[PDB]
């Protein structure tokens, strides 16, 4: 494609503690981030103001989620409960809806399947599917070999992949709840999980600089995007709406961008004085966001 | 621009709240509490009450402490502790009453060396080697009711000394405090525990104060 280095249009200040969570809604205009000061903050790259700042019951929150209709937000963390907050309330302020308890494992990824279902995955080697109406695990995903902390959904809302940091990369199903596909062959624990916009590809990001992608239909290792001289790890990974761009967040105080087939660096997002732990691209495909541990959020457009 | 100005002013109002909330968080001191299986990590938290991470709050000499337990959480400890970087003091609790066991019921290691395999690991990972590692010596009272019985030679073969509290106490520091390959920045605050006295929380305040002072001294090239 080219050497698109970086473009820091704006910087979202205000955060004070480290950030391990960042998600974008379907409107391509709102951003949600979490921090260790017990203050979950919703942003928007169009105006750069704090639209909502809902305090967090657990300061150790490590994940975020935005509802497709922009009406709910979720948090996880080392507290084992998913505190669902309804943004649209008659009282106006953001309040908790239901606390999803019964995990007994650290929480680091709970994506919003829809306005009613949650695909909360915990660190007790088991995932779960939640229901807002009853607040109970509709499905009891089990069969992993290690703790899983990063998931990614699909536009059709009919499939998701749960990848633990033990070269598991198990592909589950929303309804039947069994491992339909499994990918193995990774040499290190994984920490970043993403899904293709088309819904027929799946990539992982591990703590070995070996960001690789696989295929849903055929279980084999595609291009591994071999690093040149990078020895650090990867914390977050995301796919642009174009589908011909790979973006990953590395531990060496910077980010790198590759191509679908070139598998070569196409730009460095080094603008943060700490390791990057968040990454996300808008559903439309305009502008990119990055969260890190220096309590600074920036938008790359 | 009436709504845009109000929306912009809303962020400024929230920013003021963040500064007020951040100021309280800034002066609040974070405490990491950890231990082995029934190693006295639950006995300490019951001391400073009147005066899967659980969190307890107490005030001692204009300081807002906050413990973050680990016994109730069972996961890959060595890879989620990165979130605890920046914690001022890490309280490690080991009871001097379990230096023997029939294997480990999960591996081949007594509790004493297993605890020493966690104290060394927690002070060697590249996340906590900046401030200090506070150590607590639990089961101090019951230690005497086992030192005149079967000695420390069961756990420590190289033990060569007397069979009293004075000789034993000096050894305990060597077993735990001398577990740092780096001593330029990290320090171990070894001090015993009182079963029914308030001196346990007194050691918390000054030790946390000492590392706080050294943290400022270490910065700006003054220590």
């Amino acid at each position, epitope marked *: 494609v080219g050497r698109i280095q970086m473009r820091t249009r704006r910087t979202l200040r205000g955060h004070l503690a480290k950030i391990y969570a960042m998600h974008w809604g379907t409107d391509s*205009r*709102l951003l949600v981030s979490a921090s260790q000061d017990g203050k979950l903050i919703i942003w*928007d790259s*169009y*105006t750069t*103001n704090k*639209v*909502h700042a809902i305090p967090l019951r657990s300061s150790w929150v490590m994940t975020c989620a935005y509802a497709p209709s*922009g009406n709910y937000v979720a948090c996880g963390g080392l507290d084992n409960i998913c505190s669902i907050y309804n943004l649209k309330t*008659r*009282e*106006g*302020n953001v309040r908790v809806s239901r606390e999803l308890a019964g995990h007994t494992g650290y929480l680091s990824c709970c994506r919003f399947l829809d306005d009613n279902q949650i695909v909360t995955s915990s660190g007790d080697t088991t995932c779960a599917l939640w229901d807002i109406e009853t607040g109970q695990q509709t499905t009891t995903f089990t069969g992993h070999t290690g703790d899983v902390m990063s998931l990614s959904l699909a536009p059709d809302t009919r499939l998701f992949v749960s990848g633990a940091c033990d070269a598991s990369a198990k592909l589950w199903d929303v309804r039947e709840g069994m491992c339909r596909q499994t990918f193995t062959g990774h040499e290190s624990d994984i920490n970043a999980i993403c899904f293709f916009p088309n819904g027929n590809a799946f990539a992982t990001g591990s703590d070995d600089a070996t960001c690789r992608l696989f295929d849903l239909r055929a279980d084999q290792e595609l291009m591994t995007y071999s690093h040149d001289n990078i020895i650090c790890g990867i914390t977050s990974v995301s796919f642009s709406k174009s589908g011909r761009l790979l973006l990953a967040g590395y531990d060496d105080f910077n980010c790198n961008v590759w191509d679908a087939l070139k598998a070569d660096r196409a730009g460095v997002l080094a603008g943060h004085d700490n390791r990057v732990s968040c990454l996300g691209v808008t559903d439309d495909g305009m502008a990119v966001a990055t969260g890190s541990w220096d309590s600074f959020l920036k938008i790359w457009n | *621009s*009436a*709504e*845009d*100005k*109000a*929306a912009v*002013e*809303r962020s*400024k*109002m929230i920013d003021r709240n963040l500064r007020e909330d951040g100021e309280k968080a800034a002066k609040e001191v974070k405490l990491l509490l950890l231990g082995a299986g029934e190693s006295g990590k639950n006995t300490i938290v019951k001391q400073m009450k009147i005066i899967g991470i659980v969190e307890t709050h107490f005030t001692d000499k204009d300081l807002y402490f906050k413990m973050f337990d680990v016994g109730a959480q069972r996961s890959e400890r060595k890879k989620w502790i990165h979130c605890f970087e920046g914690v001022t003091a890490i309280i490690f609790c080991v009871a001097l009453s379990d230096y023997d066991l029939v294997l480990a019921e999960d591996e081949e290691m007594n509790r004493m060396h297993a605890s020493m395999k966690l104290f060394d690991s927690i002070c060697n990972n590249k996340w906590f080697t900046e401030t200090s590692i506070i150590l607590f010596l639990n089961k101090k009272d019951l230690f005497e009711e086992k030192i005149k019985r079967s000695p420390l030679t069961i756990c420590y073969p190289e033990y060569t000394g007397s069979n009293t509290y004075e000789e034993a106490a000096a050894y305990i520091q060597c077993q735990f405090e001398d577990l740092n390959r780096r001593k330029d920045t990290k320090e171990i605050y070894t001090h015993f525990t009182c079963s029914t006295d308030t001196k346990n929380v007194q050691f918390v305040f000054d030790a946390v104060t000492d590392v706080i002072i050294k943290n400022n001294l270490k910065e700006c090239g003054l220590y």
Partner: single-chain antibody, 232 residues
Framework: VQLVESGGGLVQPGGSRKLSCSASGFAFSSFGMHWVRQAPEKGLEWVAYISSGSGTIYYADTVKGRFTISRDDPKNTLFLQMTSLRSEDTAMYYC??????????????WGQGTTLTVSSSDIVMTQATSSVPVTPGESVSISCRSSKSLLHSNGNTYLYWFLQRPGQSPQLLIYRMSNLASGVPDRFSGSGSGTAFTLTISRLEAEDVGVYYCMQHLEYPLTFGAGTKLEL
């Protein structure tokens, strides 16, 4: 969640009387408070506005020292501090709840208000064709004027749509950019290119008789329709 007006009214001619509406069941801390005033026969017009934290003290074009606003946020209530009297004060004062952010719906819930009888640049936006006597099922259409464009370069039109049942507080139908608000039922819509807006309600039914408003929100001075007179 429930606002009712009290404090007095019609105490004596020529005597100042400050009034305040009681509020309940919401934060109010992050909520804008308006004092939009209704004419004795037809027309609900805005005179005061305060935002969160009392930062914004926007007043109406009829600027006077007697018109003041005070945010009773600690009490969740509000203050007016009326001074002197005038023939224009014979009116119907209401209370307004509003919040300002992306995706928000300002002017959602309005109180019942009270009647205050007194004895001895702007879009204006008045519904010119406010007389169409039609039976239910006729797909009523109401058109409001606009002096200039209401799009402040943000891609959305800062126009609010209302519905006032007889003897009841006004209810907003669709907020800016022609989107549903306040949880009101469906079939409430309407939009236009520029400086020309229309009402599109199909599958017409009852419980919609009264007066309709057309509000602009481009800048500090707000305005509404003089009055719509469409009945069954």
């Amino acid at each position: 969640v429930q606002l009712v007006e009290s404090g007095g009214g019609l105490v004596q001619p020529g005597g100042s009387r400050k009034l305040s509406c009681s509020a309940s069941g919401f934060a109010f801390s992050s909520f804008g408070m308006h004092w939009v005033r209704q004419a004795p026969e037809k027309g609900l017009e805005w005179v005061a506005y305060i935002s969160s934290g009392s930062g914004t003290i926007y007043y109406a074009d009829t600027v006077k020292g007697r018109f003041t606003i005070s945010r009773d946020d600690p009490k969740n209530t509000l203050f007016l501090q009326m001074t002197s009297l005038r023939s224009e004060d014979t009116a119907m004062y209401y209370c307004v709840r509003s919040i300002y952010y992306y995706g928000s719906s300002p002017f959602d819930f309005w109180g019942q208000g009270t009647t205050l009888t007194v004895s001895s640049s702007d879009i204006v936006m008045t519904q010119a064709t406010s007389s169409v006597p039609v039976t239910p099922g006729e797909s009523v259409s109401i058109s409001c004027r606009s002096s200039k464009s209401l799009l402040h370069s943000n891609g959305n039109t800062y126009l609010y749509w209302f519905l006032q049942r007889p003897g009841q507080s006004p209810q907003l139908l669709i907020y800016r950019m022609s989107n549903l608000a306040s949880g009101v039922p469906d079939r409430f819509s309407g939009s236009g290119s520029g400086t020309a807006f229309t009402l599109t309600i199909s599958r017409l039914e009852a419980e919609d008789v009264g007066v309709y408003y057309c509000m602009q929100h481009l800048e500090y001075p707000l305005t509404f329709g003089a009055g719509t007179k469409l009945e069954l």
